[PDB]
Swiss-Prot record, chains A, B:
Cleaved signal peptide residues: none
Protein name: Globin-1
Assembly mode: Homodimer.
Binding positions for heme b per the UniProt entry: 100
Span of domain Globin: 8-145
Similarity comment text for this entry: Belongs to the globin family.
């Protein structure tokens, strides 16, 4: 249930999301590209979903991947801005869920982003506490898939 | 080229965009929904394209409509944040263009948003100079369609 998952975003979780986002969200291009390339490198079996982007091993040099990456960072921006209001967060979550459901992405496959998030956070000196906050957010999308 | 169109936006046009977005982009739910419902009122022929959103006449009450509208505002957020780097603006524009090409939305039909934008701007007392600036940004997307 997306509503019950949404309810798990307590005060403290909300705080850690915001605090960490101030750092990560400040370089959407660099951080968005790092997230995607870490996904591809650690979870080789997902690359086939992204045929439209072309040669993903090109990283920042691939225009489509750069376009994709920036845009994904605005989806995260979106979620962060909706934390005050659960009915609003849920509706945006459901919109992006649709984008993945049509590409045949399951909850389980969607959760493969947790690895890359924890890594990108760690590279910025945000630890397990923060990785765990982010898993709770990703879980809300999971509940929609 | 899109690059050409992007590259042409001047310091004055950029200033007008940023200034008006400071206001319009501060209420993404209210302003995005306003944009969409004005499109529907003025261009009833477009309603059919949005069948996934269900009964668009329900306004803010329609959760799918609200999610699409807030998300639309973040596409604009993205555009605005990329104005100083034509290379980055081009790659996000091309990403959004693909979303519309796939729904068979022509450059001319995309341009139907100018009306709703002019009205929303007007609502906050941004006049003709501001609507012309926004038509120039829209023209970047039309360059890709
Ligand atoms: C933090 C988690 C994620 C976010 C916020 C997110 C966000 C997005 C957004 C905004 C789009 C563009 C939607 C569209 O234009 O149709 C998208 C597309 C896509 N996503 Fe995700 N994504 C995430 C994780 C994942 C993961 C883990 C997978 C694969 C396991 C995945 C697979 C895809 C694919 C295949 C597409 C379409 C790419 C294309 O052909 O343009 N996403 N994602
Ligand atoms: C400022 C102008 C516009 C912006 C920034 C914008 C942005 C977006 C975004 C971000 C999406 C979601 C893409 C996806 O997830 O698949 C979308 C979808 C869509 N757009 Fe636009 N759009 C604009 C104008 C228009 C206009 C003028 C039309 C029609 C004449 C249109 C038709 C569509 C349709 C049919 C969809 C798919 C809706 C659905 O079934 O989910 N768009 N747009």
């Amino acid at each position: 249930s997306v509503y019950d998952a949404a309810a798990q975003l307590t005060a403290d979780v909300k705080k850690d999301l915001r605090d960490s986002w101030k750092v990560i969200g400040s370089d959407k291009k660099g951080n968005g590209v790092a997230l995607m390339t870490t996904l591809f490198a650690d979870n080789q079996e997902t690359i086939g979903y992204f045929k439209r982007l072309g040669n993903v091993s090109q990283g920042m040099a691939n225009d489509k991947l750069r376009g994709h990456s920036i845009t994904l960072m605005y989806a995260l921006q979106n979620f962060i801005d909706q934390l005050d209001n659960p009915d609003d967060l849920v509706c945006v979550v459901e919109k992006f869920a649709v984008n993945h459901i049509t590409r045949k992405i399951s909850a389980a496959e969607f959760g493969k982003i947790n690895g890359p998030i924890k890594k990108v956070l760690a590279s910025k000196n945000f630890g397990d506490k923060y990785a765990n906050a982010w898993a709770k957010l990703v879980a809300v999308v999971q509940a929609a898939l």
